Enzyme design. Structure first.
Site, PDB file in Angstrom:
ATOM      1  N   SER A 179       4.325   1.686   8.351  1.00  0.00           N
ATOM      2  CA  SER A 179       3.981   0.791   7.405  1.00  0.00           C
ATOM      3  C   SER A 179       5.139   0.284   6.374  1.00  0.00           C
ATOM      4  CB  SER A 179       2.828   0.462   6.102  1.00  0.00           C
ATOM      5  OG  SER A 179       1.535   1.211   6.871  1.00  0.00           O
ATOM      6  N   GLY A 180       4.952  -1.245   6.164  1.00  0.00           N
ATOM      7  CA  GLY A 180       5.992  -1.753   5.772  1.00  0.00           C
ATOM      8  C   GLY A 180       7.599  -2.469   6.382  1.00  0.00           C
ATOM      9  N   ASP A 238       0.214  -7.641   1.872  1.00  0.00           N
ATOM     10  CA  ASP A 238       0.327  -6.591   1.721  1.00  0.00           C
ATOM     11  C   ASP A 238       2.328  -6.014   1.448  1.00  0.00           C
ATOM     12  OD1 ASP A 238       0.709  -3.463   2.024  1.00  0.00           O
ATOM     13  OD2 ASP A 238       0.034  -2.997   3.971  1.00  0.00           O
ATOM     14  N   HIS A 260       1.126  -1.208  -0.514  1.00  0.00           N
ATOM     15  CA  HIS A 260      -0.178  -0.357   0.010  1.00  0.00           C
ATOM     16  C   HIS A 260       1.118   1.330   0.346  1.00  0.00           C
ATOM     17  CE1 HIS A 260      -3.631  -1.379   0.630  1.00  0.00           C
ATOM     18  NE2 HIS A 260      -3.221  -2.268   1.705  1.00  0.00           N
TER      19      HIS A 260
HETATM   20  N1  LIG Z   1      -1.509   0.027  14.330  1.00  0.00           N
HETATM   21  C1  LIG Z   1      -1.827  -0.143  12.461  1.00  0.00           C
HETATM   22  C2  LIG Z   1      -1.124   0.686  11.738  1.00  0.00           C
HETATM   23  C3  LIG Z   1      -0.062   0.838  11.632  1.00  0.00           C
HETATM   24  C4  LIG Z   1       0.494   1.194  10.295  1.00  0.00           C
HETATM   25  C5  LIG Z   1       0.150   2.509   9.777  1.00  0.00           C
HETATM   26  C6  LIG Z   1      -1.602   2.875  10.250  1.00  0.00           C
HETATM   27  N2  LIG Z   1      -2.329   4.086  10.180  1.00  0.00           N
HETATM   28  C7  LIG Z   1      -2.382   4.966   9.124  1.00  0.00           C
HETATM   29  N3  LIG Z   1      -1.781   4.285   7.651  1.00  0.00           N
HETATM   30  C8  LIG Z   1      -1.792   5.400   6.423  1.00  0.00           C
HETATM   31  N4  LIG Z   1      -1.014   4.874   5.352  1.00  0.00           N
HETATM   32  C9  LIG Z   1      -0.518   3.432   5.332  1.00  0.00           C
HETATM   33  C10 LIG Z   1      -1.348   3.305   4.148  1.00  0.00           C
HETATM   34  C11 LIG Z   1      -0.441   3.587   2.341  1.00  0.00           C
HETATM   35  C12 LIG Z   1       0.477   3.121   2.755  1.00  0.00           C
HETATM   36  C13 LIG Z   1       1.355   4.595   4.013  1.00  0.00           C
HETATM   37  C14 LIG Z   1       0.420   3.355   4.985  1.00  0.00           C
HETATM   38  C15 LIG Z   1       1.620   4.162   6.291  1.00  0.00           C
HETATM   39  O1  LIG Z   1       1.808   5.485   6.423  1.00  0.00           O
HETATM   40  O2  LIG Z   1       1.835   3.365   7.513  1.00  0.00           O
HETATM   41  N5  LIG Z   1      -2.309   6.033   6.699  1.00  0.00           N
HETATM   42  C16 LIG Z   1      -2.963   6.893   7.280  1.00  0.00           C
HETATM   43  C17 LIG Z   1      -4.104   7.880   7.579  1.00  0.00           C
HETATM   44  C18 LIG Z   1      -4.706   8.181   8.652  1.00  0.00           C
HETATM   45  C19 LIG Z   1      -4.285   7.888  10.022  1.00  0.00           C
HETATM   46  C20 LIG Z   1      -3.792   6.846  10.275  1.00  0.00           C
HETATM   47  C21 LIG Z   1      -3.081   5.809   9.262  1.00  0.00           C
HETATM   48  C22 LIG Z   1      -1.602   2.166  11.803  1.00  0.00           C
END
Ligand SMILES: NCc1cccc(Nc2nc(N[C@H]3CCCC[C@H]3C(=O)O)nc3ccccc23)c1
Length: 227
Positions: free
Chosen positions: A183-184, A89, A41
């Site tokens: 993430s990642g 993912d 993502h």
């Molecule tokens: N604790 C679980 C968890 C783990 C990782 C990320 C998040 N939260 C969120 N993640 C992301 N985005 C994901 C998906 C898209 C790629 C970018 C990701 C990132 O930045 O980790 N976009 C957001 C926008 C508004 C509020 C929260 C979040 C939550």
């Protein structure tokens, strides 16, 4: 990372920052000499922006001897990933050349045995994602130690209500939690990569919405096929 602490600089030599147009976007993990594992993502909508991988880093802004930005030859999202689902993912980034290895840059061994961890196993998650509700971004790498949460608790109607497949795992999210920007990145248990952070549940630090992490062992054939 909500609720965490400053990581020891260079103590996680597998840790990568996946960058888009020169800004940190997501975590990643060096899994081979020329390959970083991250989340699909992250790049879903990256279009033709410039994707790079920063290895050997602690600070995102300061010069450090081991810090090197790599270009990316190829981005390989899992073929079954989709925006808007939590499944599959994973993303593999092939660096333009093999990374220079040293004390501060080394691939992490990853789990090839497709069986669950013991409940409550303390695993380490690190990242440069936000560190409070306001959205503050740290210059330097943060981490937290999180106990694994058994899949049945995670699947409760109160929790993620059946969405946690055999290919996913959970960790507790009570105030300490991965968040946007993480993430990642790696979930490391026993010195071995076990999971990769995913945003499937987008909220942060709510104990009723556990962290979700994609189980690398479940995707071993795919990782090998792409390498
Ligand atoms: N604790 C679980 C968890 C783990 C990782 C990320 C998040 N939260 C969120 N993640 C992301 N985005 C994901 C998906 C898209 C790629 C970018 C990701 C990132 O930045 O980790 N976009 C957001 C926008 C508004 C509020 C929260 C979040 C939550």
């Amino acid at each position: 990372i909500l609720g965490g602490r400053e990581a020891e600089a260079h103590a996680r030599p597998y840790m990568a920052s996946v960058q888009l147009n020169g800004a940190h976007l997501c975590g990643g993990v060096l899994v081979a000499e020329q390959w970083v594992l991250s989340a699909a993502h992250c790049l879903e909508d990256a279009a033709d922006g410039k994707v790079q991988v920063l290895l050997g880093a602690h600070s995102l802004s300061q010069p450090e001897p081991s810090k090197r930005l790599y270009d990316v030859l190829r981005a390989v999202p899992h073929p079954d990933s989709q925006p808007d689902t939590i499944d599959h993912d994973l993303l593999l980034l092939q660096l333009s050349e093999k990374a220079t290895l040293g004390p501060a840059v080394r691939p992490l061994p990853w789990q090839r045995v497709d069986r669950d961890v013991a409940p409550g196993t303390l695993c380490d998650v690190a990242g440069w994602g936000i560190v409070n509700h306001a959205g503050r971004r740290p210059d330097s790498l943060q981490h937290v130690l999180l106990p694994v949460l058994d899949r049945a608790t995670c699947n409760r109607r109160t929790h993620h209500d059946g969405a946690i497949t055999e290919r996913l795992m959970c960790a507790e999210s009570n105030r300490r939690d991965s968040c946007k920007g993480d993430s990642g990145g790696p979930l490391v248990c026993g010195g071995v990569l076990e999971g990769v952070v995913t945003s499937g549940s987008r909220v942060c630090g709510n104990r009723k919405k556990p962290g979700i992490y994609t189980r690398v062992a479940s995707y071993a054939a795919w990782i090998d096929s792409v390498l």
